[PDB]
């Protein structure tokens, strides 16, 4: 396949205002434009992580939605993030992949997060998505999901012939800093144990909840080693990783071939 | 349960030498009577990690296995570590776990390790051992098995019920410093994930395939932080881990209510 370019747009949700929202992100990704082919904003982008966020939550018909296809042809680039998002099953936190082929995918966090008493009345989801865009096939997930290795594992010969399940797994999060060491060591023993690039976009900030995030928003290598990795302070960055390097790793460490087969129930 | 009180024991292996380990490793373990229940010595601590070394490789009536057996009720603890060994199966690379009672348990481990050859000639396990010892459930794997998160998992309300499968997970290894960095990764990210302590041992030094050893042995706690952790030299270190502790975390950050039910192929 050809190199992608990704961006971390590493932002300040501004707390219960989704119209604010969109404008802020809006302008940080205006300056993207041609420059990118995939677009990582934080978890729960529009409203921040909160669970009254719920009582007013959009749906697919909404202006979140619009935006996000808005953005993704606006800039030439897939874009992604989540949002709380209502249907006929309930509230979820739904991860949106918009391509500007016109394109839109979606998935809804499989483990909500317990000790922010997302499981709640938030509605749980199930399915893994793997999509493809530029000839990568990549994983997104959000936050919680990273601590659960099983549901993020990398299979050989199952979604793909002879191949691994995707080259490329993402985190959406408003990860919090009193434990930015475990989403820092868990992003980098994911791209190590799957064999695979990691991006990863947390938040950065105060929330209403009274909670701070240091950001760690990164692009790993499949040594486990930050190619790009950001801290602190609002900040985008683009950068791109190789298609080469990553189908060398794969010869040169067929660790690939001696993953244990399971069924998930 | 109680606290238990583990040695790393990271010995610069002798090459092709099953008697002169026996002697080396004996001689390091002497001054830990009476101090330690849990004695944890490398992968293959009498031949070094060698793939000739499978021709002349001991079985389970050899000198090697009343050895571990003699020094468990020598020192008043369980011993663990790998060796070759034959059977009629053919030859594995074998975790012993031995206590002072003359009671012997063992783990053929499940992934050889492909990027040295050891598939060629060895016999790879299947079963997954844990024990216990002291009030403590205990999963000892080999090396190569710490980039296998699915083998490695501690599964919630399967081997104990309304509980984790185990408590302490331990990892015997020759693992090159060229791949220091991946060790020391992923065992932090088992503690983490695995909501449990880590104990690891890895051996120092040069083999006789000139390959560089950094030891990096550690215990690790169940926040993925370590406790003790050491390098390069030849050293041992006893070390006491808080039972009380883990339940505090387990019940305040309830992970283990959120994992995945899978089954392994
Ligand atoms: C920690 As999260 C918000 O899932
Ligand atoms: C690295 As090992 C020997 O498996």
Redesign the interface.
Same mark, same amino acid.
Request: aromatic share 20%; proline share 6%; no cysteine.
């Given at each position: 396949m050809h190199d992608l370019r990704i961006s971390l747009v590493q932002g300040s949700t501004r707390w219960h205002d989704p119209a604010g929202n969109r404008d802020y992100y809006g302008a940080l990704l205006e300056p993207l434009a041609g420059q990118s082919d995939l677009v990582i904003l934080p978890e729960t982008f529009t409203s921040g992580f909160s669970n009254e966020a719920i009582d007013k939550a959009e749906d697919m018909d909404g202006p979140t939605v619009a935006w996000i296809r808005t953005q993704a042809a606006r800039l030439g680039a897939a874009i992604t993030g989540s949002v709380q998002l209502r249907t006929e099953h309930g509230v979820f936190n739904r991860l949106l992949w918009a391509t500007p082929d016109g394109a839109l995918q979606y998935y809804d966090k499989?483990?909500?997060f317990?000790?922010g008493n997302e499981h709640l009345r938030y509605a749980a989801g199930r399915e893994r998505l793997c999509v493809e865009w530029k000839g990568w096939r990549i994983n997104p997930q959000v936050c919680?999901d990273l601590? $659960? &290795?099983?549901?993020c594992?990398n299979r050989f010969d199952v979604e793909r012939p002879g191949q691994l399940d995707f080259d490329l797994q993402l985190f959406v999060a408003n990860w919090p800093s009193a434990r930015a060491?475990?989403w820092k060591?868990?992003l980098?023993?994911r791209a190590?144990?799957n064999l695979c690039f990691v991006a990863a976009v947390n938040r950065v900030g105060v929330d209403g909840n009274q909670l701070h995030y240091a950001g760690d928003s990164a692009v790993i290598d499949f040594?486990?080693?930050p190619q790009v990795e950001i801290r602190e302070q609002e900040q985008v960055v683009t950068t791109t990783i190789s298609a080469a390097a990553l189908a060398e790793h794969r010869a040169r $460490? &067929?660790?690939m071939?001696?993953?244990?087969?399971?069924?998930?129930?």
């Open positions: 499989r483990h909500l317990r000790f919680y601590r $659960f &290795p099983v549901f594992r060491y475990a060591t868990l980098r023993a190590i144990e040594l486990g080693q $460490f &067929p660790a071939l001696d993953g244990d087969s399971f069924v998930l129930g």
